[PDB]
Design a binder for this molecule. Structure first.
Ligand SMILES: Nc1nc2c(ncn2[C@@H]2O[C@H](COP(=O)(O)OP(=O)(O)OP(=O)(O)O)[C@@H](O)[C@H]2O)c(=O)[nH]1
Lengths: 94, 93, 485, 70, 82, 80, 82, 69, 75
RNA sequence: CAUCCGGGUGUUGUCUCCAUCCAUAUUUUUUGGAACUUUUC
């Protein structure tokens, strides 16, 4: 099990799960696109195989809107767990 | 059924399981540490098991390790002799 | 005087499995299978049945403390007083009880015990006109004998699925004292012998056409059903299909790795000898010789089995029987190997072709049942029937025809009788039932006066069907009389 | 002869575009894995063939992917 | 192993009802079931989500797309549970 | 409505259960048996649906319910 | 490595939970499964512009739970230790 | 783990009810443990055939209702 | 029986006109030639062509279409 | 048909001695194909 874990870690370091890891290490502000139209601008704390995330300094962005209407809303949250199926594309703004 | 039962009475030091002179002559792997269920106990023959296997075939009194008590005259010692045949050599007497 | 029978309903042994749930299974034709058990003398057939019943029923009034404990075999099927005294089976007697396979599906099964003595081959054939599949019970010691050869030939011949039981395995360890190696050689020499007679087919422990049992000590294990308890609690779910087939037959094992290699490395025992027999002997040898301290823990640490303080004190045999049954649970190994070996689309259509006109005409369209024998259950004469179509009921008037008549095949063809009662055959007792369905064998009171020996039973509202319904043949009996008094 | 995984491997440090379960993408591929999750640089968001925004350094989750293209 | 799976297996023979993700109820004799609820059924009616009904012979359904299965109430009695 | 303070689902076997599914239907009935994948056997199951107004009601009976479609379960009442 | 472990460690926390269908769920996490199946107590279901519905006990499934909104005070580094 | 018992439906024409309220027809030629279907080709339900033989993915199948008995 | 994997292999060997349908997407189809094979349904398909379905033709290059969103094959 | 030498189990009393269940994400379940907009009622 331990060996497997190690292998996984190595893979992450090497492949497409490296960037996220790096970000986590640095703890920079990052944005995430999500299935339900939620732009999650937040500070990453945890990371795993599934791309679930523990989040601090959380700032989501969406639009409560029953047509025709145009409103842009966003809320601050202190600490927030996140599920991975939601995640479409994570990004890092320098 | 025509009992085939076999035991050799001479050497107690012959094992319990033996092939008697009388008998006709007749891609992938599992994890290590996986073994038979009783593989941990090494020997399947024990010092008593010879005798125990013998007792397992006996007339009434001996095959049981538990029982009640009888009067001394309710034990029939000579009853077993005349139920079985006399053999031959004996005189008519 | 004639028989030892239970004539009061309050005294019928209560059944744990809830009879009325069994009556539900009677409708679905694919759910039930009728299986008769055949074999040579004293192979354990009747004492095999005696396992299924005691496991099925919660309390039985005919159990003495002596037959419960071990010493004397209970024989439920040998109801007749002659059979008790004669020490033998004369007339065939079955039971109808439901039992679950290993998958936990619950099927209703009708057993028929055939008498094994050569002279009673009348009722082995009466068991091959009912049994869908048969169990053939073989002694390991006596080997496969000539009268065994003729049974498998009659079964191959009569379109009946075969499954073998090699019984009386204590008589190998306890009587002969064969070492674990010498035992497996003889399990081959039999199983290797069995295949030769069976033309164009092979049996094997792995395919679950062969069952290993000893009925005196009361255990039956199928190498599939043995693994699912213990060795399947160890290694991952995906390897079991792979493991089991790697168990029997010449493959060896070193550490974690099956290698068909000659016997190389150091130790040599085949995979069967090491993973089955040797842990079987160690069960024996320890349940006799070892202390009740050492043994009590080894059952907990390995088999996940616990002996009560009562169990700790019995006697050598009654204790050994208690250890084996507590290791090998209520018997799903037999019920499984029976279930998967019966394919009705290879058979049920061919069998009826052998019992009557091949056809097929008058599809459905009639209540059509086959009357086998007139069987004496206590104080009355019943007819043992099998239903190939339609639904019998109490009070119906049905046409009945002898098989002396069907050699021939509008008014004048008609004897008629009511079907007055229909029971389920229970051994000691008979359980009342209002109706019957396709596939299940029952007992009718009131048909008996209309025939002798075999008969055909039909009820029809259509003249077209009346023309097209096929009548059964005179039943075959494997022997001819030849002995005159 | 050409399987998908090797093609993917080959296409590292090269331009790629991805459609989703929908919006097109366009960026240079950084690296890939067995699960087909992606990491890209110079990401441009083609909203039905309209580059809405240039995000830059991004990581695409595998299950939302539709196809890869040059 | 799953007890619902076992129940389903037991229900073999019986007339089960069966709705999918689509919302298209069926009712028929359960021919065969597997660990994955890959049901086959005989003599089966088929209701559309809107309303209309259609008779059909031997439907197969893949458990993935199955929503819920109704089994007859006789199976409640015995002897799978204990 | 009142109910005990359980740890798991398994420990609260045979309790009358409200059940929500992804489609929006509400199955109510006693949990006879659970699963590794949260499939539920329900003893006396009633599907209750709401068309786009007021509760439409259907009595089903003994129901095997697939966990994929299950959203969440709530306790409707005590045993018996 | 595992967030599952972290989740498990979070016990007896009065938390909001957010689903794939957007339902806001205020309750005390009594337990969570290895597969994120949340078991709440003292539960309060509200939608994202309509009235509230309260419940004593709710077992929500792991696939549904989008985002568990954590408590106010929490030492995360400590939690993250094996 | 277990094989989908579709040996009854082998070499018979089947209505493969498929994802997104669509349909397919055709005679059954093969399948696997994931319930992918290999079938000799037929139309998409007025009507128009595409292909000589066709392979349908496992996930996509709602139903495979038998046209022939 | 002809397994799906075998069929795929055959198709690959051939290099024939393959027309793929998309899972949960009626309006679009793909048309090309199979180049790759995977343990899952995923493949690489060079010279592909996106098609709007009849309720014309559109430009498209070489593509691997992911196994999860496949529906139909023909070759 | 009996007598006689003996026997099991249970209840109560009394007497003696002592003593207060897998570990992990790529088609059948839990890494979702979800959401947005509109009509009728
Ligand atoms: N040593 C040994 N003896 C057994 C075993 N099983 C049965 N027997 C004995 O062998 C005889 C066979 O028992 P039955 O069941 O009455 O034989 P059967 O199969 O009914 O024989 P039929 O008269 O043909 O019905 C009995 O006297 C049992 O005591 C066994 O496993 N080991």
């Amino acid at each position: 099990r331990a060996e497997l874990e190690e292998l996984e870690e190595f893979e992450f370091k090497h492949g497409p799960m490296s960037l996220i890891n790096d970000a986590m290490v640095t703890r920079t502000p990052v944005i995430i696109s999500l299935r339900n139209n939620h732009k999650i601008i937040a500070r990453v704390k945890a990371f795993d195989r599934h791309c679930n995330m523990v989040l601090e300094n959380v700032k989501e962005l969406w639009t409560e809107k029953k047509g025709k209407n145009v409103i842009n809303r966003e809320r601050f949250i202190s600490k927030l767990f996140l599920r991975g199926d939601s995640v479409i594309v994570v990004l890092k703004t320098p | 059924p025509v009992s085939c039962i076999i035991q050799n009475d001479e050497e107690y030091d012959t094992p319990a399981l033996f092939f008697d002179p009388s008998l006709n002559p007749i891609d992938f792997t599992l994890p290590e540490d996986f073994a038979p269920l009783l593989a941990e106990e090494e020997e399947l023959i024990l010092p008593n098991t010879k005798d125990a296997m013998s007792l397992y075939h006996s007339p009434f009194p001996f095959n049981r390790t538990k029982g009640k008590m009888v009067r001394a005259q309710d034990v029939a010692l000579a009853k077993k002799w005349f139920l079985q045949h006399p053999d031959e050599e004996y005189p008519v007497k | 005087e004639h028989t030892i029978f239970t004539q009061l309903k309050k005294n019928i042994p209560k059944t744990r499995y809830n009879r009325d749930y069994m009556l539900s299974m009677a409708n679905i034709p694919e759910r039930i299978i009728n299986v008769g058990v055949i074999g040579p003398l004293h192979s354990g057939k009747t004492s095999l049945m005696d396992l299924l019943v005691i496991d099925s029923h919660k309390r039985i009034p005919d159990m003495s403390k002596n037959v419960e404990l071990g010493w004397k075999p209970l024989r439920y099927l040998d109801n007749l007083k002659q059979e008790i005294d004669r020490g033998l089976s004369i007339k065939l007697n079955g039971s109808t009880l439901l039992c679950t396979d290993l998958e936990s599906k619950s099927r209703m099964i009708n057993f028929l015990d055939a008498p094994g003595h050569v002279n009673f081959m009348d009722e082995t054939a009466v068991a091959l006109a009912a049994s869908d599949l048969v169990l053939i019970v073989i002694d390991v010691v006596e080997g496969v004998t000539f009268v065994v050869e003729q049974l498998i030939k009659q079964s191959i011949k009569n379109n009946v699925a075969m499954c073998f039981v090699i019984n009386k395995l204590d008589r190998l360890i306890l009587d002969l004292k064969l070492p674990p190696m010498d035992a497996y050689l003889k399990l081959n020499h039999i199983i290797a012998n069995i295949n030769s007679f069976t033309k164009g087919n092979v049996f094997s422990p792995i395919d679950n056409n062969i069952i290993f049992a000893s009925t005196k000590l009361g255990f039956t294990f199928t190498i599939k059903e043995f693994v699912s308890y213990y060795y399947a609690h160890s290694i991952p779910s995906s390897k079991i299909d792979d493991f089991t087939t790697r168990l029997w037959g010449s493959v060896y094992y070193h550490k974690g790795n099956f290698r068909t290699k000659p016997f190389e490395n150091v130790e040599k025992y085949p995979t069967f000898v090491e993973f089955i027999l040797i842990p079987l002997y160690k069960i024996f040898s320890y349940a006799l010789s070892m202390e009740k301290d050492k043994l009590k823990n080894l059952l907990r640490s390995n088999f996940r089995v616990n002996l009560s303080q009562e169990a700790l004190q019995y006697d050598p045999q009654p204790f050994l029987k208690h250890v084996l049954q507590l290791i090998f649970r209520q018997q799903t190994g037999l019920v499984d190997a029976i279930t998967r070996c019966y394919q009705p689309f290879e058979l049920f259509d061919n069998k009826t072709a052998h019992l009557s006109i091949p056809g097929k005409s008058t599809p459905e369209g009639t209540l059509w049942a086959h009357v086998l024998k007139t069987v004496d259950y206590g104080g009355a004469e019943w007819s043992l029937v099998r239903i190939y179509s339609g639904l019998l009921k109490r009070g119906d008037t049905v046409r009945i025809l002898d098989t002396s008549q069907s050699e021939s095949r509008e008014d004048d063809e008609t004897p008629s009788c009511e079907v007055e009662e229909i029971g389920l055959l229970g051994g000691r007792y008979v359980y009342p039932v209002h109706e019957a369905h396709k596939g299940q064998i029952v007992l009718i009171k009131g048909i008996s006066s209309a025939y002798i020996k075999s008969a055909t039973l039909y009820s029809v509202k259509s003249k077209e069907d009346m023309k097209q319904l096929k009548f059964f043949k005179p039943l075959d009996y494997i022997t001819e009389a030849v002995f005159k008094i | 002869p050409v399987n998908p995984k090797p093609f993917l491997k080959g296409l590292v440090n090269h331009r790629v575009g991805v459609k989703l379960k929908s919006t097109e993408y366009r960026g240079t591929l950084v690296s890939t894995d067995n699960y087909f999750n992606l990491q890209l640089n110079e990401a441009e968001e083609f909203v039905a063939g309209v580059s809405h925004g240039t995000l830059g350094e991004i990581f695409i989750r595998c299950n939302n992917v539709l196809y890869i293209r040059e | 192993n799953g007890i619902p799976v076992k129940l389903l297996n037991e229900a073999q023979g019986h007339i089960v009802s069966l709705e999918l993700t689509t919302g298209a109820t069926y009712r028929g004799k359960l021919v065969e079931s597997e660990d994955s609820m890959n049901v086959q059924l005989r003599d089966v009616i088929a209701t559309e989500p809107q309303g209309a009904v259609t008779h059909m012979d031997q439907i197969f359904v893949r458990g993935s797309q199955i929503k819920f299965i109704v089994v007859p109430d006789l199976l409640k009695n015995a002897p799978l549970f204990k | 409505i009142q109910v005990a303070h359980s740890s798991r689902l398994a420990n609260l076997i045979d309790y009358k259960l409200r059940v929500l599914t992804q489609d929006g239907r509400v199955y109510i009935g006693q949990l006879m048996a659970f699963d590794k994948h949260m499939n539920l056997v329900l003893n006396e199951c009633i599907e209750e649906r709401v068309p786009k107004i007021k509760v439409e009601k259907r009595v089903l009976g003994l129901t095997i319910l697939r966990g994929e479609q299950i959203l969440s379960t709530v306790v409707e009442d005590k045993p018996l | 490595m595992k967030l599952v472990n972290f989740l498990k460690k979070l016990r007896n926390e009065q938390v909001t939970i957010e689903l794939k269908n957007g339902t806001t769920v205020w309750g005390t996490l009594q337990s969570v499964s290895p597969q994120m199946n949340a078991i709440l107590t003292d539960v309060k279901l509200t939608l994202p512009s309509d009235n509230i519905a309260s419940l004593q006990y709710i077992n929500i499934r792991g696939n549904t739970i989008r985002q568990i909104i954590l408590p106010d005070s929490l030492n995360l580094d400590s939690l993250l230790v094996d | 783990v277990s094989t989908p018992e579709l040996k009854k439906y082998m070499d018979k024409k089947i209505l493969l009810n498929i994802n997104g309220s669509r349909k397919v027809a055709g005679i059954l030629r093969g399948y696997d443990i994931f319930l992918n279907v290999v079938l000799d080709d037929a139309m998409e339900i007025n009507n128009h055939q595409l292909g000589l033989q066709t392979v349908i993915r496992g996930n996509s199948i709602i139903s495979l209702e038998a046209l022939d008995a | 029986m002809v397994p799906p994997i075998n069929c795929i292999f055959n198709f690959l060997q051939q290099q024939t006109p393959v027309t793929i349908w998309l899972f949960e997407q009626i309006g679009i189809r793909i048309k090309g030639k199979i180049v790759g094979f995977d343990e899952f349904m995923n493949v690489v398909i060079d010279e592909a062509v996106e098609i709007p379905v009849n309720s014309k033709g559109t430009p498209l290059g070489k593509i691997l279409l992911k196994g999860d969103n496949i529906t139909l094959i023909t070759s």
